[PDB]
Amino acid sequence: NITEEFYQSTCSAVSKGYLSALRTGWYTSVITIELSNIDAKVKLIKQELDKYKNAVTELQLLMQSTPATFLGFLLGVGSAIASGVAVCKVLHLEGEVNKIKSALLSTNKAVVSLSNGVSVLTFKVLDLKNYIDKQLLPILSNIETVIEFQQKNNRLLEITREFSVNAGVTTPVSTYMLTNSELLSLINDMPITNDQKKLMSNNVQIVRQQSYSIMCIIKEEVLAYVVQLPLYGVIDTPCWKLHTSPLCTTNTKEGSNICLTRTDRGWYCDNAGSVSFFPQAETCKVQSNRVFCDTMNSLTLPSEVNLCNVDIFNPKYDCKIMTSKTDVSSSVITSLGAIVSCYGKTKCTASNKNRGIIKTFSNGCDYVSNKGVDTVSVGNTLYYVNKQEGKSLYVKGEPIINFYDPLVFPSDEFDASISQVNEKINQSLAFI
Amino acid sequence: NITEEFYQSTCSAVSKGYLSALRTGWYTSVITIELSNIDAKVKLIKQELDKYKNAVTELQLLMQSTPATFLGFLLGVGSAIASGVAVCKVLHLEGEVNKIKSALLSTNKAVVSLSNGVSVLTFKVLDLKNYIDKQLLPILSNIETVIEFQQKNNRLLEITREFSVNAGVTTPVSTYMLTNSELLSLINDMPITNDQKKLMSNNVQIVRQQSYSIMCIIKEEVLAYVVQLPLYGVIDTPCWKLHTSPLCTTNTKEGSNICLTRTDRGWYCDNAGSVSFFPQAETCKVQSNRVFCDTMNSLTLPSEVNLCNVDIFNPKYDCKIMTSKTDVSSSVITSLGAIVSCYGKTKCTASNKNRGIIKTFSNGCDYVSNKGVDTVSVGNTLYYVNKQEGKSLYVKGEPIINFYDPLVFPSDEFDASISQVNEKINQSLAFI
Amino acid sequence: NITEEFYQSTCSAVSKGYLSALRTGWYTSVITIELSNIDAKVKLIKQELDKYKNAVTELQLLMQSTPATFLGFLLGVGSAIASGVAVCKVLHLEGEVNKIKSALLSTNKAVVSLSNGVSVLTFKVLDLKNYIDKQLLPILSNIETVIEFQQKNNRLLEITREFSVNAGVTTPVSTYMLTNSELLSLINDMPITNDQKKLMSNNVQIVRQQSYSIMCIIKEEVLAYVVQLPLYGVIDTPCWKLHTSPLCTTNTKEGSNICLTRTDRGWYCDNAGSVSFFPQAETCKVQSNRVFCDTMNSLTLPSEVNLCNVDIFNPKYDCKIMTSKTDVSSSVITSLGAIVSCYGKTKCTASNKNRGIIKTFSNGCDYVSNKGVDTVSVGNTLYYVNKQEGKSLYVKGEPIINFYDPLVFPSDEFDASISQVNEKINQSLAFI
Ligand SMILES: COc1ccc(-n2c(=O)n(Cc3cc4cc(Cl)ccc4n3CCCC#N)c3cnccc32)cc1OC
Ligand SMILES: [Cl-]
Ligand SMILES: [Cl-]
Ligand SMILES: [Cl-]
Ligand SMILES: [Cl-]
Ligand SMILES: [Cl-]
Ligand SMILES: [Cl-]
């Protein structure tokens, strides 16, 4: 059940009904490929064997160094593959690769305890040693062997291609790195809750986009790369999306108008007694009513930040805004409708596909729901609205920009707030 | 005929002679692939059949949810695939896929009227049902069949790969989604003007970059994805590119200087009596003298915005600037030359490849055309200039930063304008 | 030897010990592919020949036009492929392609002098003319020829695929454009120093990411694309990375606090008597202790900018800061530790994997090294620290935010500095 409320007073709208899936941690698995030491049909086999050798050499040469890779400016700075790189660094210690090679001798999956105590799931996805030693060495022939060897070697060649243009670190994790069944069985044998396994298994395409593949080591006929998978430690909490657009006065004299915009737009999810706030567009991914975000791109805020939607002048949280005199027209397409900021001479309308223009917006900030509306036009820009089913509520209220004296209004404030704007107005009213 | 003018007074330059091709709308087509229900040569065929089945399963599991995906901060916010997703949602209604399956029984292209009245062009690009049922079922053999089945199945495997790492939505649209001849014949059978067909057909690589492929439904042996193609409703209007760079005073005492920069840089195209303004770099693509832009990334401005180039103090449009005291050196490579903002101790030169340094810039903002100039250097940064043919005109004029008293100059104004700067100066001159 | 210093007084940290590799120029090579003019086994060959012809046609149609493609806002604007496009433009002049075709008749590599004097290295990587004329024309059969022709043609098909979704300009340069051995031998036959050859050869994956492939011309059975490779004219100079985080007062009354942040974070490298400053995250790539940057994304600053780390009030360089009252909590993961900006009610801790929480941060800006620390948590965000070996030094000092009177503190200054903040404070203290 997705619902939406538009606040006429602040030119903003909140879409709720979403459920969280936040990446809070990382799981590191070690994916291995076992390697071999080494007429027209034999010629094709030798050409494919050369492609095999060059791929090994290319990956060997690849890792002569350590692997590396409105309110967004308030975010901190993480190191996204620090956990995977740390595991990879452990794999270079003496005897470490040999432990993995021994654990996977009689099975393709095994949990191995690394020397520093880290327990990682290991996975041998391709045994090229067995194939080359048992099927190709006796030759050095028929066409079926040529075809089969090309099929088996192709995956190594494609993994190498990906690492070669990504400096050894890829994201999203492709099906060459981990096929769909491999990833599913990895998730299944992963030490996580039943809710997490079901969530990851039903959203593998999102899991791939939030994962990293880190080329790690070639040693003792073992090719190992670390696949860093997301841990969703927050699931099924309420989330809501805040959409904001400029609210300006609408006086006829050009340049005499003042504007404010709520700057706190983005995704919000309840999380551990606080609210995780994701300011940056497209750092969250919506699947139906589930929203996948990454806490690395969030601020942790008091839950009172939500009061800004119902009462922007509330005394418990100082709601953030920016101010200007740039009254240009635009639209913000919401989850269930469209906010329209129409100023000046701009033509602003809403239309249905079958009937055409059904509403002409007057100057100011207004809203239409997606029920019976297919597009909105603001100036020369046509916007298609989202056709998701859900109820919108229009909350009438006097635009708060009307409460300000333009003669003392502080414009060109970007990182401002209700209180900071009051503070500056008081200082200007004092000097006069 | 590309031409350029440099305005010494405002440290800016305008390149004109370009012709518009603006994406104003979207066309949605439905691309279908028909699917089949299901010794060494048979073993290779069974391995390829398993890859076929796993791809179907992977795509089935992929769509258990709804598909989703200086002055730029003034732009609105659209929902780029809202139109395609709406069409995809219609394809899930009962009987809808069956209509497409029936329309394409005896032909690979057909226009189908969907239940909600939407008329979409449909296209069956691959009949794997016919191939597997008529060529592979009788077996369950020779090597040529193995090769042929791998060739036909590969496209399904690659489409699936693309969707798997893009969560079901890809852009640009690859030749696996729509081959070049397929796209060309799609454009040809598209209900659009002759000018649009010629424009799209001669610029298919740009059409691909402005299109989306949306994985939609697998149902009744039909795989359908929606290809959302750009509609160019504005073509062949004049466009011009505005380049700007900081203009600072050049006093010797460090820190005593003041700067302004025109913030209205970007692409401008005449459009329907107004001007479409594209502030963000690389949201427009230039092909010779044709500039492809997307109106979703534009403001719609009065045509008087153009007056800022010839007279930044004009009374009809309030030209936008930012102010600072950060007099750092840089260059802006224009269409036909280079703007050089040289301040402090920076070494700023222009060179020809055969002769070396031909000009040393003094402190201030200056310009050289690309005629006889191959590179400019500002500090430790070497810039190659564009070698496009065209005439430059140097418009001499006193740098407007000289008209300001630094003691009342308001610096650190980002979203400012000529008038707002005058307004603040008047208030500062009043208190004194 | 990577080392790090944390400055408690300014909530910042400098990581040093790195060595530079800066792209300062471009080298343009011309890569060519020689082309041919043109039962179940012959049917597969004819299908592959059609894919060959369509690829040629697609590339012909592709180039009917000219090829094109905190403090970051201070950077200039370059034209990254201006040098390659200029070389490509020369290849269209009459007789130019014929010179390359003649130079490569008896050898696959040759230096050619173009008509405008430009000396380019040329490279024929694939002779499809010889293969089709000598192996396929006599037929118009066996399965080995079908397999071999698919192998040879595949590279042309993949190059075309890359150009088709990139509008003729790709970066990174893939192994289809230039295989690893091809690139290595290109570097080896390149007219550059021994240090550059060793540097490029040991970091080919970075070379690929800093290179462009520009589809140029199909003419006289020759397919030519220009590969624009980086020239590293600055190597082995000291580089250091500056990390910064907000420094706020910690009074209990919400909203009464003031903040400043050093805005000069990014990479710094000594360069030709000045310092190249790279403000933008991830425009530099670190390989062990070598940092690859691009001077196009740099400012050239006086070396005195370094004084801001030891003495932010130094009289020789005016250190840049931003000011606000937005005291939100976050962390910055450094090279060898973590800066923690903890304000309000936020829970801020540091943990070891084996023992859990070992330190709880109090309000203010603080730091922990990565020795014995695996993660830090600030609010709902868990950060893994980098586990690189190296020594950290904690430089104690009074937070400089304590020196400011909040009643006259100018907040919401983004492009500010120590002196500009003093200037504004003096004007506010004068009116009172
Ligand atoms: C990507 O889209 C965006 C574009 C701009 C903003 N944005 C800011 O960051 N600031 C703060 C600020 C004030 C200031 C003063 C001067 Cl003298 C110079 C640089 C200044 N900066 C940073 C500018 C960075 C760039 N370019 C803004 C202040 N007013 C309006 C918009 C602002 C936000 C965006 O995210 C939606
Ligand atoms: Cl979203
Ligand atoms: Cl929707
Ligand atoms: Cl451009
Ligand atoms: Cl050019
Ligand atoms: Cl870095
Ligand atoms: Cl590290």
From TrEMBL, chains A, B, C:
Keyword field: Cleavage on pair of basic residues, Coiled coil, Disulfide bond, Fusion of virus membrane with host cell membrane, Fusion of virus membrane with host membrane, Glycoprotein, Host cell membrane, Host Golgi apparatus, Host membrane, Host-virus interaction, Lipoprotein, Membrane, Palmitate, Signal, Syncytium formation induced by viral infection, Transmembrane, Transmembrane helix, Viral attachment to host cell, Viral attachment to host entry receptor, Viral envelope protein, Viral penetration into host cytoplasm, Virion, Virus entry into host cell
Main location: host cell
Entry-listed glycosylation sites: N426
Keyword Coiled coil applies: yes
Gene Ontology CC annotations of this record: host cell Golgi membrane; host cell plasma membrane; viral envelope; virion membrane
Disulfide bonds: C11-C365, C239-C269, C248-C259, C284-C293, C308-C319, C342-C348
Keyword Signal: yes
Topology with respect to the bilayer: Single-pass membrane protein; Single-pass type I membrane protein
Signal peptide start-end: none
Cell compartments where the protein resides: Host Golgi apparatus membrane; Host cell membrane; Virion membrane
Any one of the GO BP annotations: fusion of virus membrane with host plasma membrane
Subunit structure as annotated in this protein's UniProt entry: Homotrimer. Heterodimer with fusion protein F2; disulfide-linked. Interacts with host NCL; this interaction plays a role in viral entry into the host cell. As a heterodimer with F2, interacts with host heparan sulfate. As a heterodimer with F2, interacts with host IGF1R; this interaction activates PRKCZ/PKCzeta that recruits NCL/nucleolin from the host nucleus to the plasma membrane. Part of a complex composed of F1, F2 and G glycoproteins. As a heterodimer with F2, interacts with host RHOA; this interaction facilitates virus-induced syncytium formation. Homotrimer. Heterodimer with fusion protein F1; disulfide-linked. As a heterodimer with F1, interacts with host heparan sulfate. As a heterodimer with F1, interacts with host IGF1R; this interaction activates PRKCZ/PKCzeta that recruits NCL/nucleolin from the host nucleus to the plasma membrane. Part of a complex composed of F1, F2 and G glycoproteins. As a heterodimer with F1, interacts with host RHOA; this interaction facilitates virus-induced syncytium formation.
Function according to Swiss-Prot or TrEMBL: Inactive precursor that is cleaved at two sites by a furin-like protease to give rise to the mature F1 and F2 fusion glycoproteins. Major determinant of the species specificity of RSV infection. The trimer of F1-F2 (F protein) also facilitates the attachment to host cell by binding to host heparan sulfate. F protein is involved in the entry into the host cell through the interaction with host IGF1R. This interaction activates PRKCZ/PKCzeta that recruits host NCL/nucleolin to the apical cell surface where it can bind fusion glycoprotein F1.
Record family assignment: Belongs to the paramyxoviruses fusion glycoprotein family.
Protein name: Fusion glycoprotein F0
Gene giving rise to this polypeptide: F
